[PDB]
Structures are given as structure tokens and as C-alpha cells.
Symmetry: D2
Subunit: 491 residues, 4 copies
């Protein structure tokens, strides 16, 4: 949801500088400050070596509590910070990789040196930035708001927009470090007081051997893992928004959601009379949901793009373009729901990006690459939805489901001139969606404004990176983006 | 007949003497030899630092798989050894304490030494005995059969039968040490080849603060943890036997079982007095279980006692006394069932051993003491039931249910002249059992005597004579 | 004397019964209570994670300071405890195995847990006794004074006197455990308060490949390692006592001592069966020391044996027999000196136990076994000397010398019809001792009183273990050992 | 020279491209290549888990062997690699920080994962650079030689020349990471094969509390540490070169050296603006050493600066300016000596850079800042001297001396209108140098060639960073570089 940052030996001035542009509150730590935006969540608890802070939220508390409850009865009533603290002290830092959520866990030790654990999927990207002072934050613009326009040093666009695939620790900010998701990090200072980050991954590469898991056990597993995220949200939400494209992924989420929540709000978007309203409407009627559409203009499409960049700090062309559809939905649902579920990521797990009937030497490898890519882009950041009063959730993106699909036999993902076979089989087994739907132009508009080809994501990344820098340096306002300013960034 | 033992720096010859008294197969290890009884189960897998071995079985595979599945899809198709290995390498040794079962895990490192993890509840007690050679086993008699009648050195009964409470590492065998349950051990050797055990607990004491958990959530948890053990056994068993005492404990298990298994075989034993065949038959009639009762003779009561001492190597009088009924049920159930569920343990978790209306300064402390006590008695060993072709299981004795009750608020256990209140409430809410059922030092000297007699090979389980027992003072 | 004990989770009242038979001071701990005998030494210092204690003394502070000094200047003026804490926090527990001395290091952790490191040679044998409460002491008899005559349970003599070679963790006390020397130990308690010792060794077995080290380098190493111990004692002692037998070992030590101390007192013993006063006098004359010879009677031999058993808690027959000479020397030197140097162990390193003309398949392995044997006997305990007001020191028994000789080429230990060849060359190079000495019957007296052969050490150990038991149970007095008691012990 | 690099999954092409500009040889590792220049040194040995490699050399083997000799006899004949392996396995990685030398230790694991330990002083700066492939090297120019002129991405000079104090992990190369000196680093690869360095410091900040060590012991320690380094080189060198400036520092080193080596070659240099030939000649005469003078020209002066830049990869103006004198000396001594000693560093430990009679709130902190600064500049690199056939050594720069002086009471470094007080006292006590030397304009020439003021070091840094880049990009060659090409950089 809302962002946060920590500044080593920060001053009240640093905090007041941030609050002039970002609403929130500061809290003193042993040797510095902690700032959390107005809609941010966090919990704390005293530990043996210091105070533990858990910023953000947890998505699988039921699973986490079930785990700690194995040895500690107090897990059932522990706050987010206490819960992870139990896992930490009993099973070590590696156990926190088991938690899902847009969270960041850190222990504030007396010596000012803190130990931090970053969530392992990219729901909460964390950076360590070296400015006048050392900062740790999941929002680079907070550092600019505190230290000024020149705080972040950006790399040459030619060196940045030259590659589409990057390590999960990649950042275009020269004076910054992107903390690897799913790792423990200790923020030390040497004899002269210079910042030195000691990092260690909490996970190891999983086996790539084909997983020949029988059909029945597989379907039972998909069902349990897709519903778990919903069973966790149901208890605290009566209404839920869902972006309905009419496609299998979003339709499946709606079908499952109609069994956990009482009120369902579905939203559909199109462009240039090029849409899927036909199918989308059929799903809404089939399940009796509060449906409503909206045909986006070329202007609204670009707006969704720049908004995803501002809020989720996305500098990647492809990712910003895909996020456009979600941001236009947030705007339509704003004030109508507080929780949203999407079918996002399903194509990366079950083979939706594969070409039907085509042959692949290693389809799982091709997919795994895309699952990893999402770790650094910012597509999974929750800031955008938070600023719309929405708790965004992606049911498909759970550790258990992701791991299941990682090496799942391909014939389940691409077979007999079809894709996502096993998902479709699971879909109609619910007896909720019509065979028609189960089956068993943003990229263009974006290219249009830039004056390039639809497939040229290098020119699209050069533009997105442009607005990225302008937004993070504070020279562009998310509230005031004139068409002239946009055109300047284009050419 | 599901025991095992390992001899450090031993050969297959050192196992020969064992195979003359116990049937089973031997397997070579990097440095030493392993022996497994005829009906013993075991799996293996190749790790980076050696070969991993898992002896015995796992009760919460579904839970362990769900845990390793978070990061590894290979968990779904892994044997017990590969499954614990995944947990070991990714979450460390401490993770193996989350597994439930009468198992022992160890890694045969090519560096000579082996790393051992013992199960955390006492389902499979492991000793390291120092005789002519060093042995690690879950059955002390195996060492005797290997090295002779005098292999094991016993303590003076005067010092053994004195106290009623002991640490979970206590053993009456002077030349042996009992490996702490729920611990990782490294059996190394110094510059002169002398054995040295480096142990470390995999757990720490839990909070003793009163757990003021609301009623609804609490009941939801009870229902979950009590049923989980059955959901795991249901898939691989058509029929299941249950020792029906007619009480709330055994009755509840039968009620739940009837919702997971197709065929239910209930057994009720007892003597002319203190028996409860009426109540049992009532429950049996309500659940429509295949019900059978039998009155035991004084010889049978005693036989049940000595058999528990032999099979589960129990030297404690109280524990061997309680096991009598169970072991008599095994005999009556032999050949009819392969899986049995009991209500064992319930009384220690929900306050069943407490007196209604009585006032206690700290009831949970008394209960926790008894929970801990079961770790060394051997009452939870599975050897006895196994030799009868039965997989013994105690639904109540799960990590989660035990931990939950550890500091659960006393009012749930003993309130207004009542005990097991919360349990009774969960029971009748099922609408399955009749409301009337739900309610809504001289012995230790003898036990220890037969214990030594059996472990040293003097007395034999199939040769036990009434006069031989009497001769024991 | 200079012993100590700690009562895990105990109170100050638990010590009172001990102070009734042994004079000493108490010390309240966070997780129990400490007791140190009157002539005992101990230092302390606050660590970032508990209070550290060092009971006993260190023999190689110069080497330890030289090491710590590499990264910390405060090492030059740190007390023993602070000095080990520096090594502990920087190089881990394994570094404390580098320290020599009859010490024991432990951390009083606030979380109710003790972290202890035991010295690696056996100079200070530590045991954990389980009575009504858990005890950690370097003197079993202290537990008896605390809980009473039935505090310690002993094993059947037949099961104790049957073997000659044992593990360094062996103890005849059934309800006790002997902490392995040179290991780190954590004393904790489980959910029911029962104590549990978690141990880890600080060293791994060394190489057994022959060490083909050249002449000059070897001699330089021997010279360095044999002199360091004396250099450590020189600054604090003007006079030093030395058990002079007239043999190479004691003669070498005497020769080296004359170059470090201005006043040397030599002591020679013997029996009515034999003696080497001729050679002993020769050395004293060559070095001009204050010499004196004492001829022992059977009674004095036995007294020396029983005293080595009481003070050092030796239960082995052979070990006690050897110690008899030293204990009688202590009685003779008492009040005359406050420090003493011996050639003890020299034979286990350079091959003194080996005979010229004899054939050995693996001489180093025979020696190494004896080196290891001294770890559990008690021969190296310092209590006995302490009670006589003497700081006993064994120059030859240093980590570096023992390691050096461990696999030193046999040709240096036995060659050309002679043993201790290299040792003889080093002594000869000093130009202090007469060539006559450089190159060339307590056992009988002991056997005579027992009424057996001098080779039967099984019958002798049965006597020693018998007195060992009687002393530790408080059924016997070291002040008065009537003949009627001595007879029953024998048979 | 003596540089080296390691390329993960490198190819014969990479190695051959390198040898096109640098002579040496490649060696295949488990999953990559090792490249070591012609005159580079290295040793290896098999470890329980992987092959251990030691590149470069050790300066304090006597001390390291003395430490490992405590538990292992094979320490005495172990090669440099086997020696650190002994410490590593027994005392952990932290123990390799005790070693001194221009070395890099790394363990090649079967899975391709490299465990590296970098020396703790900066004698062998190691970088990890991300080009087409990932490289670990102590010479950035080797990567350019392998992948071409564009392999290294350089930061804007304005950003690099804006400060003279940096973290010891600072590098002006954007696509590179400077490995912290005195740390362990695991070079892993995540699920998608992306490089991820896990680093941990081996040291912790020493105490800053004033060290009021008594004078007598102080002098004894200084003596021991300044001579130890000489005792290590003496056994393998008959002749040694010394850059004599007539100053107390170089003069003292010459005085001590004259008592360790047979022949001493003293070299002195001076500019046309001024010199120190007067005082230097006095020491040569006093100690009777083979002295030599040489007046440097504006050209030779600058040539010394750019050579320090090329060979030692220095980008810092100040540091490059200081090395000028040393490099001119290597040239004059080439072929005349194989080992050289300097008084380099003395001023930073004993207060030589402070102003006599001036007041300082915290003199030790100022000194400590400078001591740390040398870690990243490249002043301690040995490549320069190596290419001149010289094994350069700086006696003052030992861990023990550095640590001793770290917090040493200021009155020892600056008192009553004097500086380096305690050093002068120690020097005078030797009775080897004249009173006018013990006491009981290259910087200008550089400022003239550029055309700026001696005060303005940003213009000097500009030039140095410019030459740095040109040399590392392969544009300029140290073989045929001329002043004409350097003038083009000035403007």
C-alpha cells in the first residue's frame, strides 16, 4: 500500500521535507527515522536483539500462523511483526521467504545497524540509496522529496533501455542498490562510518526436472492454492472488484470470488472499438455481478501508463504498458471497492504467453524467465492501487502456485493446439463458467503516440524511463501533466 | 518389529548375532552398518553432503509437503527421506522438528561422521550405547543380541525406582545415553577414534502466558487439528480399529473416524470391575461400528503389562500399567486391522487428569509436566503395535494440538466443577454422540526387574512363564 | 585451593555447605551462583551479550596479546577475561583453543544460558554433575560438600579398572558428565527446567603424515617453544623450584631456567630401592643451584599417591604412581618456592618412553596415544600444587610443541640406538650441561605395599579408585588416613 | 606484471584477446577461466570442498605459520594457499584478515560458485565488473583487453572529482563493483543465472578510546613490528633498494635495513624547484650505502604520475601525485634491486601529517581517516613495482603497527611543537642516524604543467581521471604514450 523509508541518522528536517509532498508520519528509531505514508500499515514487537518492524501487509497469515502454531500457541493472536519474529527466531531468516505480501521486515538494533528481510516476489521493491545520508526505501521519490532534485543519479538512457531482461537487483539509479527480493540484509557502517550492505539470498534455485504429477492431485492442488488467497480476504471484505476481460484468467478469478464474497464488482475496458465486452458481459451475467464497462481513449490509455510509472515507479516500457489497463480500472472502481482481485500472472505460470500448436525445446524455461522478470519491474508494487483506496491482490501469484508450475510437465501447459490446458480443465470443473469462455490494443495505441512500431519496446522504454526520471526528480507532477510536457518527453 | 540400529565402524558381521534373534535386513553405510527389522520402513536419497536415511514413518506428510511445496515442486513426489532433506537444506535442522512420526533421520557423510535428527515427541526413542563398539538404536535389546547378555549395564533399582519425574534424556543404562527427542546430533570421532556426540535442541520453551483465545476460533482449531491426522490416514486405509473405553476421549475419535473411514472396528476390554462395556456398546450402536468386548483375566492383565515393557522397552511402572489395556486390544485386533486410533493423550491436554471443583495454583503446569513425562516412558513407542501388524496412531498427540493447549486458559480445561469443558463442547456440537456419553514404588521395582530381564535376553516374549515372573521377587 | 564450581539456576545458599569444608568466595550469577576457592584466580568483563568470566590463569598471554593486537590495541592492557573475549568475538570460540592454562571461560547470558569453553589439554578438567541441581565444577568433591555424601554415584570398580586407555570424556561418576577439553558448551534447560548440555569440539584431528622438517629450523622452533613458558613466568618470579632427577628432561629444564631466573631450587627424590642422586648433584653443581635430595619410604610413596588422588581427583593407578614423586617434591618445596618447572611430558613428545634398539611400526602413533591419555587422568590438574602454594608449570606441554612433535619424523625421536635424539642435540647446543648427562623405584614401592607385581596396574587402579571414591564421598580425610583405613582399602 | 582476473564461463576467445595486450597464461577452473600475468605469483591446494587458490604473495608467513603451527605441524611446510586453507578451516574466514600481502584467496567450488576473500589493506584491490560476462579482477584494464574499448562504463568526471574522501568500496566504474578489502564474498548465480555477490566484512571497528600504554613497552612493540617485516625478507634478499628522502621515515627504514641486509641501495630524486639531496646524502654517508642521485625534469615528473595511474590504476589526483616520486625511483633502481623498502605511511600512523604545535580536537580521527583513504586509492598496489622487477614493501604498514597507533595517546604523535615524537625517540635510541635528521616540489611542478594552482586539486584530479579512463579504455598505451597525447587531455 503506502510507501515507506528509513534514513540512517536522519533529522526532523528530512521528515518535514517529505511530508510537504507526501502525507504520513515519522517515527524515531535507535539511530534514525522511519517514515510511513498516510495509508501505510506496520506493526512492531520487542525482540531480544532489538525492535522488530514489519512494514506493509501479509497475504498468507493463515498459512504463517498455521506454521508457528506448530510450536507456539501465541501465534494465533500475534500481530504481523510478532508472527514473523516467531518464525525468525525459531526457523531463521530463511523462513521469512515463506511469507507473502507487500512487506519489509527489519530489526532496529541499538548500534544503529539494522537487519532487513525483503519480501521474495517484488510486491515491495526496496532500494538502499546513498545520498547526503543513507536511505532504505520502497519509494525513491521519498528520497528526492527529502534531499532534493539532484539526490538520485540516473544512468544514460542508452545504457538503460538497451536490454529487456535484467537481474532482479537491477536499478538505473547509479548511487543506489536494489535489494534482492527474498534475501536477508544487514546495513552496517565501517570504521569510518561508510555504509556497507551485507546481503544473502534466503532461497536456492529449484530443480528444473519435469514434474510428472498426476492429474487428480494436480487439480486438487490448483484448487487449494487459488482459493487460499481468497479465504484470507473473505473474512474482512464483503465487496470485491475484479477486472473482467472475459478471458479465462479473469473469468476464473470471478468464478471463484463469487463463492467467497457477497458483492462482486466487475470492470471491463476497451479501445478503438477493439474490445472483449462481448465475453466479459457474458461472464458478468452468468455470475450476476455488478458489471460496468468503459471505452478508453488514446489519452486515457497513455494516462494509465504514466500513472503506473509514477505510483509503482516503473521504468520498463512493456510493464508500464501492461499496467495501463489496471490503473484505468482503479480509477473506475475508486470509492466503489477496497479490495480487488485479478488474473494477473496466470499466463506466466500455465503457458498463456506460448503460441498454440507451436513447438518449444524448453517452454518451462521460457516461462520461468518471465516470472523472474516481474521481480524488478514494479508491476507487483501495490502503491498505485493503495492511492485509489484499493488493496490489490493477485490470487495466482502465490509461492505455492508459482513453485508448482515452475517445472510442471509442459503437456499441461501446451498440448494439442491449445495452451493453459490444465487451468482450463480446472476452470470448467467448477461448473460455473460456460465452455465458450473456458475454451475447453494498448500496445498499438502506445506506439502511436510515440510514433514508432508496436514491437519497438526499446523506444517505449526510452519514453517510460524519461517520465520515470522526471517524476522521481519532482519536475513532473502526477496531478499536473500537460500535453505539451508529454510531447517534450516523446521527442 | 519395526526397530533399527546402527553400529559405528561396524561390519555386516556385527549384525549377524542380531539376525539370530530378530529378522531383518542390514545395509552398508560409509562408516558403519545399519540394521532394520523385518517390518521396518525406511527411505533414502542422495544429498550434497552424503546419503540421507529416514527410518520409521511420517504422520504429517500432507503438512510437510505443503511446507516444502512453497519453494519446491518436487516435494509432491518425494519419499520421506527426500522430503525431510528438502526441509533440512532450505530451513535447517530446526525444520525437522515440525515433522510428526516414529522416525529417525540421519545423514551418512563421506567425511566419516553422521548427522542425526531425532523425532520430537518420543514416538521413536533413540539411544547411543557404548559396548565393544558404539551403537545408535531405538531398541536396546538389539545391542544385547549383538554383543551378549552383559552388553548393557543397568543401574541399581534403588536409584532408578526412586523418582517419578525424569528429564527426557534419562536412561537406566549406565553405558549409554538417550538422545534428546527433537534434537540434531553429530556422532563424530576424535584424533584417537573415540566417539563423541554433539547435540543441540531444535526447539525452545514456549510461552507460559495464559492464552486467552476466543471460543469460536478455539473450536475451529480443535476441529482442524483433530481431523487432520485422519485425513492423512483415510486415503490409505479402508478399515481402522479403535479401543473404545466408552469415555469422551475414545468416543470422540470414533465419531470423527466414522466420517473418514468406511469400516470401523471398535474394541473394548476390561475386568469384572471398573469396566465400561455398556457405554462402549452405546457409542458403537450410535455410530454403527463393528463392535467387540472381552473380559480379561488377571493373567491377561499382567501379560499386557509385561508385553508393553518388552516391546516398547518401558521400565516405568505407571506407564507399563496403563499400556496393559492397549496391548490387550492389539491381541484382540490382530489380523483384523492394520491401523488403530486412540484417545490417548487427551486427558493431558484438556485437563482430564485434574479433579473437578478442585482449586489449583497452576493447572497448566501440572498438565505440561505430564505431557513432558511421556517423552521418556516409551508409552508412545510403536514397536508393540507394529509386531501385531498394526500402525498405532494417537490423533490428540499432534504438535499443533499440544502447543495450543500448552498455555490455553485454564477455564477451558477446568471450570465450575467440570473438566475438559471445551472438549465436551466441541464433541456434542457434532451431533454424533449420545449426550449421556459426552456429559456436556513396589510396582516400579517389578517393572524394572522384568525390563532388565527382557533387555538382557534372559526372558523371551514368546517364552514368558508365570513362574519366571514370580521368581522376580 | 584453586578450584571452582557453578550451580546452574541455583542460589547463594547452595554454596554455604561447600564453604563449610572449603574456603572460598561466592559470586551471584544471572543464571545461577558461582564459587571460587580461596587461592583461585578469576577475571571478568562485560560483553555486548553477557558477562564473561575466566576462572584460573593463562600461561601464554604474550602469544594471545600478540594475536589480538593484530586488530585491537586494547589487547595490551586487557585482563585475562577481556583478552579471551576479544578473540571470541573476532575469531569465534575456536580461537580460545589457542590459549594455554588451567582455565575455564564462560558467558553469563541474560537469557538464562551459559556458554562455556573448556581448556584444551586437561589442565582444568570440568564436569557437569546432576544432583538435586545441576553443577559445573573442576572439582567433583565440591558437589559432595554441597549436597552430601550421596551426591555422587560411582561405577563398579571392575567396570572402571578393566581398561587402561579411555576417551577424554570418560568419568566413573554415573550421574555426571565430563566436558570434553577444548570444546564449546552451552548449558541450557528445556521446557521443564531439566538441564541439557550442548557440546561442539573446537578442533579436528591433525595430519599423521611424517613431518620431514630440516635440522636448523626444528632446533629454532624447539628453542622458541620451550623458552616461551619460562619467559612468561620470569617477570613474576625470582625463584623457581625444579624436580631434578638427573635425567635429560629435568636437566634441560633446569639449564633453561638458570637463564631466566636468578635463584634456582632443585629437588631430588628416591627410595630405599634406588636413586640417581649422583647425576642430580652433577647438574646442580654445573648450574650452581640450591639442591637437596630426599629418600622416600613406602609410606611416603603411598601418601604422595593418595594426595594426587584427593587434590587432582585422579582415579587411575598409573597416573597416581607417577604423581607421587611430584607431590612429595611439593611437600619438600612448600614455603621455599612459589613456582615450579618440570620436564613432565617430554617423554611423550620426543620419544622418551621409546627404547633404543626396539622396533616400532608406528612410533608416533604410540606416543600420540599417551599424549591423549593425559587429557582425562588429572595428571595436569593444578589443585595439588596450588594447595602447596605452588604455581606448577610444565614447559614441554605447549600447544605448539605438542603439535610439532605430533608427526615429527621418527628419526628425530629414535635413531642410531638412541632416543630423544633431536632433544639431546638441542640440550647439547646450550653448552650448559655436561655431555655426560646429555647423552645418558616408586613403581616397585607402590606394588610392595599392595602385595603384588609392579606390572599389575589393574590391582593398583582398584586401590586408587577405592580411595578416590572414599575421598569424594567425604568418607575419608586427606589430613588423617589411619592404617586401619588404608588396610581395608587395599583389601 | 602480476595482475589476474577470473571470468565465469569464460571462453578461449576472452583469454586470447587478453594475451593480445598482456602476456601471461590462462588456467581452466570448474566453470570459467583464471588469467595470471607473466610475473604473477599463485599457489593452490585441494580442500574438502573445492580447490583453493592464492594469487599474489604473503608478507607475514612467519606470523601466519606461527599461528597455524599451534594445532598443525604441516603449517611449517605449507605453500601460501595451503597456509590460508589451514586458518580458514580451523578459525574461519575472519582469520584471513590476519594475513598481510598483495593477495586474493578464492575457493573454486564444483558448482561454479566462488568463495573469495580480499586482503584487508588495499595491497590488491579487487573489482567485480559486469560486462558481456561477469569478471573478478585486480586490473580493470584486463577486462577491456578481453571485451574491448567499451567494456567499462565510466562515471562523469564532475561526479568523480567532487570529493577526496570515499568509502573503501568506491569505484568510478558504473558497471562494476569494488569488493570491500578485508571481507568474504560468495559469487553466486540465482535461478536465472544472474550474478549476485554476497559479502561480509571480516573485521569490526576497533575501539577509539585513548590508548595510554606506558612508554617502555611502547618502544619495545614499535621495534618488534618495524623489524618483523625485515626479518621475513632478509632470508631471501642480499640487496635492497630504499627511496631515501633524507626524512625521518625513509632514514629510519634505511637504518634498520642496514642491520638486516648485506647491501643497501639508496635512491633520491629532486625537482628543479627544490630537493632534499643534502639530508639524504648525510644518511647514505652515515650508514655507508650505495647512494644515487637524480634530478627529475618536468617531463620525468609527469611521467611518474601517469605511470602510477596506468600500473596501479589510480584515478585520484593527490595519490597519483605522491606516487610520482616512487615510480621514478623504480626506474632508477630497475635491474639493480629485486626488493624495495619505504617509509611510506609513517606520517599517517605517527602524526607526520599534523602541524607541529597546532591544536587538534581529535588528531587520531584525522589520522585514521587518512589510513582508511589508502584502501581505495591504489597507492598500495604492487603492479607498478612488479613491472620494474621489484617486490615493493612498506615496513610501517603492518596490521600490528597500524592497530597499535590507531588510538595511541596523541601526546605520542604530537607534543610541544613537534610531531612523530615517539618515533623520533625510538629512532634516536638506535644511535645510527645524525641528530639533524632524527631531531632527537613535485606538487608545484604538477600544478605548473596543468596551469592551475597547487591548492586546486580538482584540476589535478580531472587530468588524472582523464588519463585513467584513456588508459583503461585501451586508447593510450603505456608503451608509446607521449606528453603530446597527455596535453590533449589537459585541454
Amino acid at each position: 500500500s503506502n510507501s515507506f523509508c528509513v534514513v540512517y541518522k536522519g533529522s526532523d528536517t528530512d521528515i518535514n521535507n517529505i511530508q510537504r509532498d507526501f502525507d504520513g508520519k515519522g517515527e524515531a528509531l535507535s539511530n534514525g527515522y522511519l517514515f510511513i505514508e498516510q495509508n501505510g500499515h506496520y506493526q512492531k514487537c520487542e525482540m531480544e536483539r532489538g525492535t522488530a518492524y514489519l512494514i506493509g501487509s501479509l497475504y498468507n497469515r493463515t498459512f504463517l500462523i498455521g506454521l508457528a502454531g506448530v510450536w507456539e500457541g501465541e501465534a494465533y493472536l500475534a500481530n504481523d511483526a510478532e508472527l514473523l519474529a516467531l518464525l525468525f527466531t525459531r526457523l531463521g531468516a530463511n523462513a521469512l521467504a515463506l511469507a507473502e505480501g507487500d512487506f519489509c521486515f527489519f530489526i532496529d538494533e541499538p548500534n544503529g545497524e539494522l537487519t532487513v528481510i525483503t519480501e521474495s516476489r517484488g510486491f515491495s521493491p526496496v532500494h538502499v540509496v546513498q545520498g547526503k545520508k543513507a536511505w532504505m526505501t520502497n519509494s525513491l521519490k521519498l528520497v528526492t522529496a527529502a534531499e532534493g532534485e539532484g539526490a538520485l543519479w540516473f544512468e544514460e538512457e542508452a545504457l538503460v533501455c538497451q536490454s529487456l531482461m535484467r537481474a532482479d537487483t537491477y536499478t538505473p539509479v547509479k548511487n543506489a542498490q536494489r535489494l534482492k527480493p527474498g534475501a536477508v540484509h544487514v546495513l552496517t557502517h565501517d570504521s569510518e562510518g561508510y555504509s556497507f550492505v551485507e546481503s544473502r539470498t534466503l532461497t536456492t534455485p529449484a530443480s528444473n526436472q519435469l514434474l510428472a504429477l498426476p492429474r487428480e492431485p494436480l487439480l486438487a492442488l490448483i484448487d487449494r492454492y487459488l482459493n487460499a488467497p481468497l479465504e484470507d480476504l473473505a473474512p474482512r471484505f464483503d465487496t470485491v472488484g475484479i477486472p473482467l476481460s472475459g478471458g479465462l484468467d479473469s473469468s476464473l478469478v470471478t468464478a471463484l470470488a463469487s463463492r467467497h464474497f457477497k458483492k462482486l464488482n466487475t470492470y471491463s475496458i476497451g479501445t478503438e472499438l477493439s474490445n472483449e465486452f462481448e465475453f466479459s458481459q457474458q461472464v458478468a451475467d452468468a455470475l450476476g455481478t455488478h458489471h460496468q464497462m468503459k471505452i478508453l481513449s488514446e489519452t486515457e490509455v497513455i494516462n494509465g501508463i504514466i500513472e503506473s510509472i509514477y505510483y509503482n515507479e516503473i521504468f520498463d516500457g512493456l510493464s508500464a504498458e501492461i499496467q495501463s489497463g489496471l490503473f484505468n480500472v482503479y480509477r473506475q472502481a475508486q470509492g466503489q471497492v477496497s479490495c480487488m482481485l485479478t488474473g494477473y500472472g496466470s499466463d506466466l505460470l500455465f503457458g498463456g504467453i506460448l503460441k498454440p500448436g507451436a513447438q518449444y525445446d524448453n517452454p518451462n524455461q521460457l516461462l520461468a524467465e518471465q516470472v523472474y522478470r516481474t521481480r524488478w519491474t514494479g508491476e507487483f508494487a501495490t502503491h498505485g492501487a493503495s492511492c485509489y483506496g484499493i488493496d490489490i491482490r493477485h490470487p495466482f501469484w502465490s509461492h505455492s502456485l508459482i513453485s508448482l508450475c515452475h517445472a510442471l510437465h509442459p503437456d499441461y501447459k501446451i498440448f494439442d493446439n491449445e495452451v493453459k490446458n490444465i487451468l482450463r480443465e480446472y476452470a470448467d470443473s467448477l461448473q460455473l463458467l460456460p465452455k465458450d469462455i473456458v475454451w475447453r490494443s494498448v500496445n498499438q495505441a502506445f506506439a502511436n503516440v510515440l510514433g514508432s512500431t508496436v514491437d519497438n519496446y526499446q523506444t517505449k522504454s526510452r519514453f517510460t524511463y524519461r517520465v520515470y526520471q522526471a517524476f522521481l526528480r519532482g519536475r513532473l507532477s502526477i496531478t499536473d501533466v500537460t500535453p505539451s510536457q508529454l510531447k517534450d518527453l516523446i521527442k
